[PDB]
């Protein structure tokens, strides 16, 4: 890959790290809950999988005394992560450029 | 510290204002709307939130007498904060001109 | 003002057009689709809106047979615009070059 | 005519690739998981569709056994096939340039 492209790689792999703390917050941020849902270890992984995308499409959610924020302060770190990479995109199209000779 | 990297902390904070402007507007905007089911002040900012990031991921969502112009608000106010920052993100690739010079 | 914040300005009416457009052909995509739940015209009108910046919360589903293409092309049509105005969004860091002339 | 859009287009022809390999990964994916939603075949396109365009609306929802990561796939699929758009779209303030030139 190229060095900007590491960059944004690089990026990718800090998310995944969030991911295990999200599956973990989850299973406290929700044993206590008014009207909980999530529940388990096993399946909270799975949880964490549909957010950091910056796609909530539902199943399970944190509640209130959960501190909401759970989900919230997962999001995000996905939100920066994916806003990163845009270091390599600006770059795409000055490539336009390079193939102009073959540089 | 830089230039652009303090204007994007400037545009976080106007999001945060947009969020505590929504939650007074939300609830007397649903006080009389059918089905409603946001309601109160404390978790009426809970709802705003989510409907900032546009995910919603699935707590609750206002209905059409509250005036749906109040989420849509929201939602996009949210979007252009994130879009904003982008004067940070699109230097970026620019920093790899002066690293090439070393100074 | 700059040249492409005219520009962006101009897309962002070209999403409110399909709206207009979306909400007419919901109305019958859904009124006599099976599964329907759309229907009334001045219900139709507010779906037309969130669903353009994305969210998913149009507070409504389509099925298959109104044409799942009428959700799915407001839906890109808001990306385009969106996606559109990033024009603007880069010659932001660009107006730093200035700044560092006092030009 | 434009080397950045015949680069951009194609992007989204593989994306339709993915929708139709995914598609028939997701029903027999979902075919086996307990509490299994996305049990159509020919209506799996159409879920494909809104996940790849990341908002899933409110339709359907993978489960677990489903392999999740088949739903994340579409998902990561589109994210990186329009951000690769970004080529062409961050090159249009730079046709300032020419704009300015007039020629």
Redesign the interface.
């Known amino acids: 890959s190229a ?2 492209e590491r960059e944004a790689q690089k990026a990718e792999e800090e998310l995944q790290k969030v991911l295990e703390e999200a599956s973990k917050k989850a299973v406290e941020a929700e044993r206590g809950a008014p009207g909980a849902a999530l529940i388990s270890y096993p ?1 909270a992984i ?1 949880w964490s ?3 950091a ?7 399970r ?1 944190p509640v ?1 005394e959960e501190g ?2 759970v ?2 302060q997962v ?2 770190a996905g ?1 920066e992560v ?13 490539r ?1 450029e390079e ?1 102009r000779r073959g540089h």
Do not use: N, P, Q, S
Request: charged fraction near 30%.
């Open positions: 060095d900007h399946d799975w999988v549909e957010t995308t910056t796609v909530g499409y539902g199943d959610y209130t909401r924020k989900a919230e999001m995000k939100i994916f806003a990163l990479v845009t270091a390599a995109l600006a770059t795409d199209f000055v336009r193939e």
